[PDB]
Amino acid sequence: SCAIDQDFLDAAGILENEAIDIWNVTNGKRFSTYAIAAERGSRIISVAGAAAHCASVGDIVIIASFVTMPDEEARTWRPNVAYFEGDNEMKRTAKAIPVQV
Amino acid sequence: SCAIDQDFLDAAGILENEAIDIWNVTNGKRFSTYAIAAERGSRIISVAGAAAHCASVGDIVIIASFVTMPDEEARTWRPNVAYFEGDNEMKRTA
Amino acid sequence: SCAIDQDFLDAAGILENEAIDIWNVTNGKRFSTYAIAAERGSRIISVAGAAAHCASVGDIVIIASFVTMPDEEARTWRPNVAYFEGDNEMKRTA
């Protein structure tokens, strides 16, 4: 379906076999599939099968998952967001506490 | 993201980070994203990234959220609706 | 409706009247409908009505169902997958 470096899944809290939405920034296509884990550190985002009609190598995409919970909990819920640049390099931060000047 | 003036979110009962559907009255496009709050009183309705392929400045849209509940509750449920005109001027009724 | 050989439904754990997503590998179309059982051993995958605008005889498709469960359960969950080739000949592994 869509294979994703396990490190990226860890950061976003996305599970293997979880429903995901993929929003293609490059071409505007929007679709839903499920996540599979790619090897840790591979930095892979692979699209397979039917979904390959909706994204090409080099396209920039946002991959999201959604959960349900009662309203009371939802009021303070915080999503797990990972940001990327360049060749799927995950940005910190999480900055190191300043120990040098 | 779809950033939305917090006052508008309050009136519709929509939460930050809640799934929303956007139905574009102008072009007929229909998509789903999530809500983020814009500054109170800004009157902002902002689409970013991929969603900017589906709406443009000036387009008239409906932004909806859906919840789940048991049948009995559903049968007496009243949605929170805010109606707009003009410079995103909000009213309680149409 | 999407009528599906009951043997195939059993292997994938899909229920009659359950919501299903259909992803058309041949043409890239993606849609959602519900499953109805076809006769056991018929090997039928039938699309009707509106859905016949999205698939044709010969198209290769993936038919999926989704369930909800708490996080802990989700973290050890193993989907029920049936793999096909040929004359809708089913296997357990690919």
Binding site: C2, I44, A48, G49, I60, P79, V81 | - | -
Partner: peptide, 24 residues
């Protein structure tokens, strides 16, 4: 009343591989 909320996202990742013949 049960809400649907953003759980998490990968923001602006790049597709590295794509093919109709890949499995999954």
């Amino acid at each position: 009343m049960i809400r649907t909320m953003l759980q998490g996202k990968l923001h602006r990742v790049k597709v590295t591989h794509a093919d109709l013949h890949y499995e999954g």
